[PDB]
Amino acid sequence: APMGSDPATACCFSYTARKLPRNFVVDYYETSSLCSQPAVVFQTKRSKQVCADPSESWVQEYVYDLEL
Ligand SMILES: [Zn+2]
Ligand SMILES: [Zn+2]
Ligand SMILES: [Zn+2]
């Protein structure tokens, strides 16, 4: 899951290989450009924080859905 728990500095070294159901995703943040790779981290109803590849369409669609 990300290394660290502060959205300002936590980094992802892998991405989820499963699609998260929209009904279980409740929040997100973007990882810092200081991290080795870009990532969105989604928080879920099971209290997980899940790294995801921002180049995937569904990740972008969920981010807009949460933000706006
Ligand atoms: Zn939040
Ligand atoms: Zn779409
Ligand atoms: Zn904001």
Author numbering: 1 to 68
Give the published text.
CC chemokine ligands (CCL) comprise 8-14 kDa chemotactic cytokines (chemokines) involved in diverse immune functions. Extensive structural analyses reveal that most chemokines share a common core structure: an N-terminal extension followed by a 310 helical turn, an anti-parallel three-stranded β-sheet, and an α-helix. CC chemokines also readily dimerize, primarily through the formation of an anti-parallel β-sheet at their N-termini. Certain chemokines, e.g. CCL3, CCL4, and CCL5 form polydisperse, high MW reversible polymers in excess of 600 kDa without the assistance of GAG.
Unlike our previously reported crystal structure of the wild type CCL4 polymer, the structure of CCL4 P8A is monomeric. CCL4 P8A maintains the typical chemokine fold. However, CCL4 P8A has a distinct structure at the N-terminus. Instead of the extended loop found in wild type CCL4, the absence of proline at position 8 of CCL4 allows aa 6-9 to form a type 1 β-turn so that the N terminus turns back toward the three-stranded β-sheet of CCL4. This permits favorable hydrogen bonds to form between the main chains of residues at the N-terminal loop of CCL4 (Met3 with Cys11; Asp6 with Ala10). All prolines (Pro 7 and 8 in wild type and Pro 7 in P8A mutant) are in the trans configuration, thus the formation of type 1 β-turn is not due to the switch of cis-trans peptidyl bonds of proline. Furthermore, the structure of CCL4 P8A reveals that the P8A mutation promotes the formation of an N-terminal type I β-turn, which prevents the formation of anti-parallel β-sheet essential for CCL4 dimerization. A P8A mutation renders CCL4 predominantly monomeric without disturbing the integrity of its core structure (aa 10-69).
